[PDB]
Structure formats: structure tokens, C-alpha cells
Symmetry: C3
């Protein structure tokens, strides 16, 4: 299956995944209709034979962010190499929404959060489903400022700290 | 035909290929019927524009391992960049069958062999195929111990030492 | 689109792209009929979420190389991450045509040029399309010497200097 081996060559470079959401305005409008409308990133591996992770977003917010914020979560997926890895998952995760301006002409102001995975979080235990994240990661009023939206797309970056 | 350029994106990370054989028990029973039943790994490159190598296994053994051992071999394949490389192939190769237990929760005991390629080995000369390996790499009695089989799959790792 | 996501997994290793042109003699003969016959490399990214570049060649030459030289150019393509990058593009580019002989049995003599991108070059500005290069990169008389052609193929290498 060429789709299935498509997914196995999805690996983060130095632990970094950048998820591009294009056609933001059309996707936001759909999210504002659907009460729990969640977009999912392509699966990515932390390192080559490591953990399979996936990022998701609620363009019109989840929980306390509903109607006011973009909510961002990450979750562990069942991976082909899980029985070789340490459990529970515990690498520190950092979320960013990118300020899309030229780093030479200004200093971009990315919005960033970082957490250390909770050892009791069910999803961070060895897969055999609720992801961890930020319901109020960035508000609709803030994402309209600077260049968090540009050419009608947004960039979510997830970066995992690998001890190497 | 996207499969062939799927193959050109198969590269080892730092010289390392991990080959997952799933559904071990059904594959073993087929191997116990067919006298020389050989499974082949996906091709992988040593480094980015390097040598194309391939691992193979006889789940019910080859030669002196027939009926008692898993036999593991590696071979050089014709690669798209061969005329740029040094010949014969000579990087040291290390085979492992992985003990699939949690490295924090225990200390996995992987079984490992390593060889230095023989310069007279016909397959290690420049291609336009007998692979080199171990007929008695691990016995049927040993693979049933610890976690060399887990969730009905086994992991063969091939590691190539790149001088860089 | 599996062809479109084929392209997003095309990245240079340490900034390096090697473009193999096989069936050189048939392609050259076509080039000698078509006055401005240009072959294009697969797109490649400088680094993981970096600039999308593309190499091209005129097997029977372009401009002052027409009829006598292989001409080589590079150009910036619209990339999925452009608004995250510095503009104009400015990493130094190095072109090579590889002498395809064994580096242990001989010392290969690759032909090499290198330039620093001109800040006023229209193609090196942020895309919303003329590439920069060498019309007389290597002459038909020189490419017939040593092993610049071997097994009826040639290797063009482009290497980008990434500051990291």
C-alpha cells in the first residue's frame, strides 16, 4: 500500500514537525458551524524508529476555547516500533504558531507553549486516545494580528526534545 | 510506477535499517514447508547517494541452520550511484535480532553478529547474487525466549559503519 | 495527491542534490534537434522546511553554449514554507559534473563552478522565472573525456551552503 508506506517515511527533522493549514478562512468557516470540528496533521515520527505522534487543531476552539481560540493538541499513535521504546512517552513537546514575516526585515513573534508529558496521561501510555494540549492556544483576535495568517494559511509547529 | 522512486527514498538513518517481520507464526509455517523459503527486506541505501543493500532471512534456516535456526544475510544490489562509489563494498555490517522489552523496565538482551566484508566476496564487487551472513544466527529454541518474538513479529536490524 | 506529496519528501542531504541523467546519448540527440531543449531535475528543498530549488540542463547548450556545451542553471520554485524564509535567496550554490571513476583506484576530476546569488536576480526574490547558471559549463569535447559519461549517464550535483 503506497498510502501506508507514505506514512512510514513521515519523520520529523531533529524532532520538528511543521503543519501547514491552507485555505484557513474556508476551514474556519466550517469549524464555526461544526461544534467540535477537529483537523488532524499527517502522522510523524519523533525520530527514525521512534514514537508516532499526531497534532490536531480546533480552528474555532475546544472546551474553554470554543468560539474564541484555536486549540492545539498532540497525541501518541500506535507505531510500528512501539515495543522497542520506553513508555510512557515523556519527551518535552513545544507548540508554536508561526508569525509569517521575513526574519531579516523584522523579528517574528511566534506564540509558543511547552509541556512535559504527564506520566499518568492515558494517551501517553503504550498504545494498545485523548490528546494533550492547549484549548486557548491563540485567540481569534490575536491570530488576526501580525502575520499568524498569511496567504490564507497558518503554520503549526510541533517540536519534540530528543535526548540523542 | 511510483514504487521505484519510493525505493530511492529508502535510506538508512546513520547507516541503520530495522526490518520488521510481522505475522511471524504464519510466515514460519510457510517456511517450514518450503525448503529454501527466503524473505527479503525493502532495499535501503547505506548513506544518501551510497550503496544499495538488502537483508534477507530464512525463518526456518538455510544450510546448516535448516530446520533449527533463523538465517540472516545481506547483499549488495545494483544502485543508481554505483560508479561514484568505492569498490568492493567494505563497511562493517552488524546484524541484530531485537529483544522487544522496555529498555527502562528491563535490560534488553539483543543478539548481535558483526563482520568485515571479504574483498573477494563476489556479491561485494561492483554490480552490473550470494549474500553474506549467518546460517545459525538464532535458533528456534532461543527465539522463543525473552521477547525476540512479541505481538507475533520480529525485528531484524542491520547497521552499517559509515566513515563520514 | 501521492505525486504532490512525493515532491514534498524531496530534500537535499546536507544541502546536496545529485541529478542522474540516464540514457544520455538518446537525450543528447533529441537536444541537437530542439533548439532550446531543457531538461529539469526533480524539485528539491535546501533544508527540511527551506527553499524549493530546481536544476536544469541544456544537453546541447543554451545561449553562448548552443551547439558546443552542456549548460546548467538553478532556479527558485514557489515552496510551501516561503513566508517563513529570508528573501532574497542567498546561499552559495555549487555545480558539479561528476567524473565517474573509482575514488580509491584513481582521483576523479569533477568539473565545478560556484556562485553567490545576486540579490537583484528576479528569480531569487520571493515567488508569488529565469534561472541562474553557466551556459558553457562543460563542452561536448570535454564531456567525452575521463568518465563524465559512463554507462550512458551523467551526474550533475548541486550543493547549497546552509549556515546551520
Amino acid at each position: 500500500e503506497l498510502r501506508r508506506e507514505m506514512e512510514e517515511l513521515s519523520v520529523s527533522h531533529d524532532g520538528v514537525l511543521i503543519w501547514k493549514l491552507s485555505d484557513y478562512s474556508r476551514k474556519l468557516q466550517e469549524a464555526k458551524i461544526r461544534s467540535n470540528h477537529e483537523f488532524f496533521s499527517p502522522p510523524f515520527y519523533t525520530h527514525r524508529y521512534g514514537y508516532k505522534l499526531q497534532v490536531s487543531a480546533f480552528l474555532n476552539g475546544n472546551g474553554s476555547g470554543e468560539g474564541s481560540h484555536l486549540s492545539v493538541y498532540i497525541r501518541v499513535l500506535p507505531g510500528e516500533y512501539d515495543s522497542l521504546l520506553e513508555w510512557p512517552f515523556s519527551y518535552k513537546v513545544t507548540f508554536s504558531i508561526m508569525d509569517q514575516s521575513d526574519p531579516s526585515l523584522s523579528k517574528p513573534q511566534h506564540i509558543t507553549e511547552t509541556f512535559n508529558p504527564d506520566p499518568n496521561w492515558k494517551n501517553f501510555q503504550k498504545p494498545s486516545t485523548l490528546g494533550f494540549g492547549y484549548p486557548k492556544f491563540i485567540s481569534h483576535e490575536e491570530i488576526k494580528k501580525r502575520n499568524y495568517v498569511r496567504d490564507n494559511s497558518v503554520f503549526i509547529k510541533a517540536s519534540i526534545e530528543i535526548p540523542q
